[PDB]
């Protein structure tokens, strides 16, 4: 059983919403160190990893370690009610259910049932990426939607001080070159020319719930998977590992 408290129920809501467009169920590993959730999309193309150290919660009491499988859509409904300055309380006891309290002006407590979820043990890979980029949710959300109107795959290209994103349609196309001076690109670090393609449809769910000011770190390599990291409260981290589309 545990008692976890997060300040700012909206930001937390959005987090779960994001890392949920590809999955229906998840098991959350609650330990003394923090909360972690790891799962793969039904197609086994995207790996979703969520790590939330105790450090980011205002209150962190974990008596006995636990893993609670919950239906993400159900959970999303509840958290959708949280406001920016609402405090989020997560209480687990002996019973087989999770207590959630959105505390504030309209404080209310919801009861969420715990289901069993096939917990596929898989670790997070340390891939030898050759290119790292830090972008703004805006530009990235734009290019991904833009590309979805012409092709089913978008291509990533990165060379020193330069990052491109293009796609070829049946009639018209899309392309976007960013350099350190587009501020849509906040940082870039490559080691060698790096090209790779990915599925617009997977990137869609991955960037759907990204604010415009949100910042994301993307790491990839030629004909290799792409990694996207979103930091929450600085230490908390949401990671997506996306299988490439090889030519």
């Amino acid at each position: 059983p545990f008692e976890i408290v997060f300040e700012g129920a909206k930001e937390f809501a959005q987090l779960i919403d994001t890392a949920s467009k590809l999955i229906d169920e998840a098991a959350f590993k609650v330990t003394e160190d923090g909360i972690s959730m790891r799962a793969m999309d039904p197609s086994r193309v995207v790996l979703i990893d969520l790590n939330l150290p105790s450090s980011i919660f205002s209150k962190y009491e974990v008596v006995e370690p636990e893993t609670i499988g919950v239906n993400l859509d159900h959970l999303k409904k509840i958290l959708k009610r949280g406001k920016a300055k609402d405090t989020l309380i997560l209480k687990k006891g002996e019973e087989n259910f999770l207590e959630i309290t959105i505390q504030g002006t309209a404080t209310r407590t919801f009861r969420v049932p715990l289901i069993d979820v096939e917990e596929m043990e898989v670790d997070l890979p340390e891939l030898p990426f050759t290119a790292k980029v830090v972008v703004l949710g805006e530009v990235l959300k734009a290019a991904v939607k833009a590309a979805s109107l012409v092709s089913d795959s978008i291509k990533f290209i990165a060379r020193e001080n330069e990052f491109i994103m293009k796609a070829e349609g049946e009639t018209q196309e899309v392309e976007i070159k960013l350099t350190l001076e587009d501020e849509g690109l906040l940082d870039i670090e490559v080691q060698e020319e790096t090209k790779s393609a990915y599925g617009v449809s997977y990137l869609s769910d991955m960037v759907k719930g990204l604010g415009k000011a949100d910042e994301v770190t993307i790491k990839f390599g030629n004909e290799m998977p792409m990694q996207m990291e979103y930091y929450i409260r600085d230490e908390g981290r949401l990671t997506f590992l996306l299988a490439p589309r090889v030519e």
Partner: protein
Amino acid sequence: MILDVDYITEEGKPVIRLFKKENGKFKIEHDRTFRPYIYALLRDDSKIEEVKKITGERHGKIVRIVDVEKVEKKFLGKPITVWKLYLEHPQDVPTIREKVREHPAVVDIFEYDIPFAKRYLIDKGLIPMEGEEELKILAFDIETLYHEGEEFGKGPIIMISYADENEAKVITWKNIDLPYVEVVSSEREMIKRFLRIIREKDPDIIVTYNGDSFDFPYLAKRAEKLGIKLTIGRDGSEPKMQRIGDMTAVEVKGRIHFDLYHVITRTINLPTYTLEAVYEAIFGKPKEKVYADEIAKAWESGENLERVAKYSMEDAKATYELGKEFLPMEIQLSRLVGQPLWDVSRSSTGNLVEWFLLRKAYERNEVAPNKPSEEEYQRRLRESYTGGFVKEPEKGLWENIVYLDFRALYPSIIITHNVSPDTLNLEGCKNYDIAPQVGHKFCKDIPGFIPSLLGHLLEERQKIKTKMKETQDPIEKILLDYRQKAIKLLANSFYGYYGYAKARWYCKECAESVTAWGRKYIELVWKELEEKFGFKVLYIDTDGLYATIPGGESEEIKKKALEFVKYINSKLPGLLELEYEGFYKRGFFVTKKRYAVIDEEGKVITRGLEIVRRDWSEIAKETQARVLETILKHGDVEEAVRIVKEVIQKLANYEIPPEKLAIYEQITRPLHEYKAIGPHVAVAKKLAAKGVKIKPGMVIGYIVLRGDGPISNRAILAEEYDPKKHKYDAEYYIENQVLPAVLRILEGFGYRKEDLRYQKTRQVGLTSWLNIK
């Protein structure tokens, strides 16, 4: 030499005329002595007294049985005593027929629906085209402005071309400077000159290609509108309409109007039967086509009329060449059965056989059965009928294939097993042959009527083939190659006659029996071919079998295949015989009736695979051929697939020329009548607004484009298409053009569309970049 036969009436008496060409001179013989007659089977050959008194009326007077005579013919082989009831005129027969078969005195009547002129040739023992008289051939064609949704005969006849043994001219009423064009004053004058040419050429045979429904009729309309007599007949008479079969033909009293359409169309299969296509598929030589749009423009704005004139002289030269080509055979055929060329050239093989039996029935003293009654004919059309034996083919690609076939299979069976109506299930025969599955019995004691005649026809044929490879008169060695081919055609027609609904000597049992026996010998050959010589039968169809010794050497196969033949022919009964027909380096059989093979000369033979109809662009046609030759000539489906993929890709990366994408089609009628609006039909009315020709007779080339709505609304004229301005629908050309053409061939090897489609990138799973997975 007798050209044709008819009869006019004088004083109410028939006057049979014979149109002859004896020694370059056209002569007309009259014969006022032949007499119409029917046959009556009287149960009591004494009641003939009150029976020969019946009478009827058709146009006033009362038709009287001007005579009777007890004759002793025989029926289906058995003896019979009937009475020959003479009449004064042919017309009187339908009258008294209705009666005579009423009076209980008769059991039934016979030989009563046979045309007077035809009855004459038969009885008189006269056979047409007999002899070696030089016949004058003249071909002619007409070009008009007529289209489709317009009045037939309204549009003028633009030109009239004709050609013969040595000359090919065009008559028109607008100036064209060409040594072969005869300019004339008016349409009327054109018609006059034409009438004059036949007067001066005086042909025995006038050749046309579909002149029965187009040329002559159209000519008649115009002559009339312009008030001219069409004095084409050697007796100054006009071409006349004459019902034959279920159509309306045209005759010229003193000459033989030979219309190629009927002959060609029924002795060669083709997607369509345009003069161009036919000339091409008979001589290989191509023939350019000029269309409505062109012709109308050239005639209107008198510019370019030279090529529209060449097309015309081309049409005639073609019709003439084809005529000389098909005339020899049809003539020998007319000689074979005993009827006039005009009639034979327009008859079916079944009616061709019937005519033959009728005179062979009279030569022997055999009375002829009657046609089935309207109800008999109807429940006969309703009765199922047998067809050619076909073995589901063995799949895969095979090498060193031999094709063995039976020589004159059905005729041979009919002969050696005495299959005929008059020998079917007789009783008390010293010997019978029994049909394999249907168990029908056939007396072997006395040769059946039909088997007797068929036996003689085949003996007579070998005679030909013998006296043929012998003599050294190439012209003769040609004429008799024709006489032997006519016999071949005629004999191969007996099988189907047995089941011909309107046949007198119809016999469903004979039909089934011939088929069952066919099956028996096919299966026997198949059985011993695999069980004794170690062959593997790949495909059988009606007469032939394809086989091979899996893995065996090419010469071993050819050697053993031939060994097997001589071996099996020793065991096969009567005239049944198999022959080593051909050899193929490699081949494959997709489904019944669909296969492909290739001889050692590299010549490919295919059925039910190759895409023909213009409905296919050259990219589809071309690729399918790349595929077919790679598999047949080199044996690898693998390089075939490689090809298809590369092409599919080029289509996708817009690397294929617009021409190999253009699909052509002609407008069948006004663009306001079209229900189903295809691409061209839409590129039609699309340009119609832009105000243009759009005359039901022109072809509209199109190219589908990367639009959003259906194909139709997105096709651009095969010219209003320009790159860097147009993006063709590669998906269309891939999914509805190249894939279908190629899958008829690759599907069988296990291939599928998924395997041939293209895509630059493919989604892969993440799992291999994971470790604990």
